[model samples]
Target: AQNPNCNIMIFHPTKEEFNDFDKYIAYMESQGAHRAGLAKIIPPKEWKARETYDNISEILIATPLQQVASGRAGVFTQYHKKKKAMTVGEYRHLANSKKYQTPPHQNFEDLERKYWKNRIYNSPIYGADISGSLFDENTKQWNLGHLGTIQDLLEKECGVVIEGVNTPYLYFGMWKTTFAWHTEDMDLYSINYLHLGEPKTWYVVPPEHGQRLERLARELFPGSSRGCGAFLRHKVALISPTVLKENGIPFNRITQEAGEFMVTFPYGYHAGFNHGFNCAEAINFATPRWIDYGKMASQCSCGEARVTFSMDAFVRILQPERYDLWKRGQD
Candidate 1:
């Protein structure tokens, strides 16, 4: 039997509230994963109708897919697991020229159009000031939100400001594009906003049960040539909710629609696939509370803290001021 800690909270805030720090405090109040409706936040004029899958596809259709060493993307099969690394250009050239006929799913002209369309992940920055990401900049367009104000303070007092720490990533998914279960770097909290498109479904596991989930995943997908990958370690483990429920581990489901914001707290394990064509932007940021788990994060499941840990310069200087203020609050 396992513990059930999969309760997901939904936050409904108007554009005004989303722009206001005090208004959005409730997001931090809840400890686990969070979902919110941001329908009220207007899409930028340039982004209007431009955030579609077709629009993104037109721009990136010819681009080669970013093949990592793990070869993770789309559905995983044994062939895919053992498959050598390849780019969209190479994959298409081999398929169209009739040179390779292994998986049997490649279009010459469109190439990995569908494949690329399935998972187009990008992290881009487009602001010059404290409003370093889409969330902060868009909040500025609407002329509200304390995102900029807080960052301004962080830079002013901390004497260090890192742009990447505040940049947001772009995600485009179609059909079965999947991101196996994993936590954000260093277990830092993340906020995902579905800019536009169909709903995306997410499964969240409580942080406390991380190790248990790891063990359960191993049991479910015993190592094999053709098997679902292990959780937190391998690529994917398509474990059903019923199985987890039966095991006493509760799983919360989130069918996120466009204009909605989802937040995963430190150590929260979340995985999901796109219901259909969709575009979204997400980013990870730190809070004073994140310091609570700073030490233990390196040992956590999502691998190293990735980019979050590199801001040591910022952390070193910022901690003193933060310590004095938070210490007083604690006393």
Candidate 2:
């Protein structure tokens, strides 16, 4: 259990689009919470009579292990409820019961405690109505009636998913950060927004660093899936190179301008921002099922994209020696 202090490669997301209106939080809270592939959470805002994103993301990722180990990565969405009002003991008891294939461990509860006790939390953007969380482990039905839809989250995000032309993928989320720099779960090309006030970013680092993350994953969360940190996995991240020193690799300053660019981040640790409003978003997710995750991303007219996040990319991204030939050439 090492505290994932900020020691990561940095890179900025090439700007693609911008919406000064800013509604990612509510969008995530409602619809963004569950993407058929990419999902997230956010604060609540006043929207018309609509539940949230379509159940395109109904298939859930399930794990029986309470600890980060003993689970598979990329199965389904886990935020069935917000912060549950269950005592740890009660949760453990219920979780251990036959209610679920694996006992439920009040995860959202852990989020609340960590948010207050430690300065580690991921509420995405703030300034909205984030009432009580909703997750009924008993029924396996999570009530996320606060935010909007995944499409809404995408529309409000910094990048643009143009109407006619081809565009890179975009996947945004607002889940909790139980641990820092732990990415044994889904693997989508990513960047996250840090809400530590005055908003900053840590961009794409060198590829070698990604190797260190994989090693850390094997050593720490071997034989299981993890989403609490940012190691071997390099998905769903936003950075502020200003608040912290740059992790070397060149990157886009998201707030600088909305442009299209490509950058890579090596293994880095998760370091949530200080008090005040905080949220993060990531563009560059899977859009087409035919597009190989190992091939160069395709951009054309009508990007017609489908969401995809898995451990395949991370498995390769963290292999330092494999990418060594390329790195040497760059050097």
Candidate 3:
């Protein structure tokens, strides 16, 4: 049984509304859109596509196949033990092939393992830093690199670009290639743009239910959770929405198609899989509201060392007046 509340909020913004990115997000936030943890945006039909490097065909990455034939989430270390190298073009051809039409039956693990060993499933070209080569300087509307309002305050105020966070990352996905459930670095907001190809399905839990979901993950993967307080960072655990509902956790589903954008709020847990071959670009950004969340994100639960931006430096630079006031109050 699907929960009626599990539907993600979709927004179709006009050119004028979309151009004023901050104002539009504020409007949506006011309307309680953030409560869904994820929102889908369809750009106006007249919007121009950003330029991308033609040499993408020459770029290569290692790919791994997941056990998509089974309904379970593909835990990388558990299921996919091998990887193959392939170019974007090669991956597209393989993703469109007819070899994966039949689902593997139960008790076929050994046979299926050999069958999928060399296949490409999700070959993410993550943190490629292709902004200069792929996009024009003047396009600021939805360009993750140049957006104004949700711009990386760390980069803008602190003058440092945190790779894969402030910098844009490119992702390539084939059918059933899954990204495990996790939040963005430092609990910042994330926005993803699908450059072209088939749709991507996203499952998200609102920020309020984030702890509940974490508790559930700990219970489900006791060994992993006990081993590391931030086990989800491994990007190996996958859980279905049906299981989430059975556990009383609220979840929402959203499908993002070509030329569309998906936004995830701070501390919003999201994971999803691709319908087929697709290319998407994503980056993490921070607004004024993210400062509080950033403070809480300084360290993982078990004191594990994780890469994080300097929230103190960001507050001092971006909000010097407030910082001074707080310092004076402390004095």
Candidate 4:
């Protein structure tokens, strides 16, 4: 049987382990992850929950125009299940007031405890995915090296993650900002840091079977093919776990808490929803290992495999380097 653990595994890094980041980097590389974590870098309480959250909301409200200029936040209402344009202030008021209650059916206060969990991304509440201006100093304190970690090494050499560009997007999701099921852009790897907040629920399936799952999903929803054009990035087509299980595919479910790092490996299919109001930061990247997988994933996804170099070319260069590293580590 294929190693399900490789498909998805969790690492609980202590402050000690965080100090020695390389050991765990190797561990994550070996584990299966379209999404992995519920792992942490910053210790709990280091970021005061209320203060952090309050700060986030205040930032959005204060710089409503700037965030709007950067890019209007993506908004989707459950009633329509479609994204619509809204002003930053419009989204902020709902978040601050907790306006997602399916009212009449649920009161605002009751909805606060009950239905708010299901509401989509509200604002820059941290947990699964929230980001902002490059915190170079903060990242350094966290010992996060933009171009020194294994992932960065691969990026520097193979250009698999960024391919050529080097800008990461910041996400501030509130109660229900739902990130639908899909792989990282271009099948690249991604690492998300949960700055702080409520937990996030993640559903991940391994890359080996991502195509199979997508194929089955299309068959079930005849019209899905038309919608999932360009590699299943149509709107969020909710695929049930039971459906995947019935199809003999395996998956892992995790509710990620604050201060944890979630890593999504190449070709891994993952989708998640906020369990509560929170925020997190994520960026797309890839490694040398991602070379073959990127090609296969793209081919499987939409029959369009965009590659800077042929597999033979990449293997010739990347394989020897990996072998030498493996030999050194194996002693």
> What are the models' TM-scores?
0.56, 0.27, 0.73, 0.62
Write down the lDDT that model 1 would get: 0.45
For all candidates in order, the CA lDDT equals 0.45, 0.26, 0.64, 0.48
lDDT of 1 by residue, 1-331 (tens): 2112345666555544545443354444553233211112223333332223332322232222222222223322211122333332343343333222222343321332333333323211111112212343334432222233324335554455644334555665544445556666545667677766655677787666666666676655455312322234333344545567777764666577786667776667777655445566766655655545543542212322123334443333444444343333323
- The predictions' CA RMSDs to the true structure, in order, are 10.9, 16.2, 8.1, 10.0
Candidate 4 clashes: the total is: 25
Local distance difference test, candidate 2: 0.26
- Kindly give the number of clashing pairs for every candidate: 1, 56, 0, 25
lDDT of 2 by residue, 55-136 (tens): 2222211221121211222111112123334332333243234432111235533433343342222222111122122222
Best by lDDT: 3
Model 4 TM-score on a 0 to 1 scale: 0.62
TM-score of 1: 0.56
- Look at candidate 1 and give me any clashing residue pairs: 19-145
Better by TM-score, candidate 3 or 2: 3
* The 10-residue segment with the lowest total lDDT in model 3: 124-133
Question: Candidate 3, clashing residue pairs?
Answer: none
At residue 23, candidate 1 shows an lDDT of 33
